[PDB]
């Protein structure tokens, strides 16, 4: 029975969730709604269950449809899950925040030094591991996709070229069937 | 072998972690440091493992020392863990943000209408369940402690009295041995 996502497709918070759904091979429809006790978007129906908060929706999607093949949270492995969480929280508290000003400015219209300084660190991390959480893809890696997608529409895309391990890491992420499927979806309704 | 927490005791981000440690009965020292690749506080050493980001540190503490008796994340139970995450994310994105202005203003020196509106919802939630994540305490409940602790030092403490289920829920939280032990610790060094 298909699970349902409500919100705009191109929305960073929706794409986080459509991505997780694609990654685990779930069946799902996306409904765009107009104008759940804060009245929040995205929302997500799994039959009787209603969820809001795209982190909780995603971690739910990744738990419901976990296989040995597709295990992107890694809760079975203590140190692994810790690193998934650490870099999830770095995406949320440091990375995403550096990109937003530049996406807002530089698509609908300072923070570039913070990101250079953040990229030095991601570059170090990614020189010692395939992926952020260690030598395996995880939610941490997937979390970076929405905000970074839009960053590469801007004329500051080329900055990743001073951070080769970050370029290669990103390219690798762009290469994934799921990631591509969603990237297509991130458009206004015409 | 004791795990180690670095940071100021009275810090909201440190207390989140000392609380989780107390709740699970772990052995731990707290070191206050001066002036981990963003150089972040709090930090946490488990022998060879170093963690930063207090959400990841806490979720780690709660996983390492999970018992059948003390299971505050509930990853074994799909819907349960979803609700733990949902209300964790509500504390982070809505609740905590309503309190900070009032703690900053009204201890070192508008947002009161947002919180009234947030409290209406918590009151509803808490009228239908013992605790936020359903009829069992969890990380979600514990997450609220630091920022709310300081809110009740202010002259707006009495506002919880218009939200009885939220008053009773809070009182219940204040009653816990762990919660009290930490509350004692949340003082400057004299
Ligand atoms: C994006 C990038 C650069 C500049 N610029 O003037 O250097 C811009 N101005 O408006 N958007 C952008
Ligand atoms: C806290 C609470 C109220 C007021 N007030 O003037 O109404 C304050 N002024 O500075 N701190 C507070």
Residue numbers in the entry:
A (entry chain AAA), B (entry chain AAA): 2 to 36, 50 to 119, 220 to 304
The authors write:
In black-grass, upregulation of a phi (F)-class GST1 (AmGSTF1) has been shown to be a functional biomarker of MHR. Recombinant AmGSTF1 has been shown to exhibit both glutathione-S-transferase activity toward xenobiotics, as well as acting as a GPOX, reducing fatty-acid hydroperoxides to less reactive monohydroxy derivatives. The Phi (F) class GSTs, of which AmGSTF1 is an example, are found in all higher plants, being homodimeric enzymes in which each protomer of approximately 23–30 kDa with the catalytic serine residues located at the interface. Each protomer has two distinct domains; the N-terminal domain adopts the typical thioredoxin-fold, with the C-terminal domain being a bundle of at least five helices as demonstrated by the crystal structures of AmGSTF1 presented here.
Importantly, just as treatment of MHR black-grass plants with NBD-Cl reversed resistance toward three herbicide chemistries, this alkylating agent also disrupts the drug resistance function of HsGSTP1 in human tumour cells. In both cases, the inhibitory activity of NBD-Cl was linked to the alkylation of specific cysteine residues, namely Cys47 in HsGSTP1 and Cys120 in AmGSTF1, which are respectively located on opposite sides of the binding cleft in different loop regions of each protein. To determine the structural basis of this covalent modification, AmGSTF1 was quantitatively alkylated with NBD-Cl as confirmed by mass spectrometric analysis prior to crystallisation (data not shown). The modified protein crystallised in the same hexagonal space group as the native form, diffracting to 2.8 Å, revealing a conformation that is almost identical in structure to the apo-protein, with rmsd of 0.2 Å for 188 Cα-atoms. The Cys120-NBD adduct was clearly visible in the unbiased electron density, even though the density and the refinement indicated only partial occupancy in the crystal. Although not directly associated with the active site, Cys120 is one of the last residues visible prior to the disordered loop projecting into the active site of the neighbouring polypeptide subunit. The alkylated residue points into the H-site of the symmetry-related protein. The covalent modification of cysteines located in the binding loop clearly affect enzymatic activity presumably due to changes in dynamic behaviour.
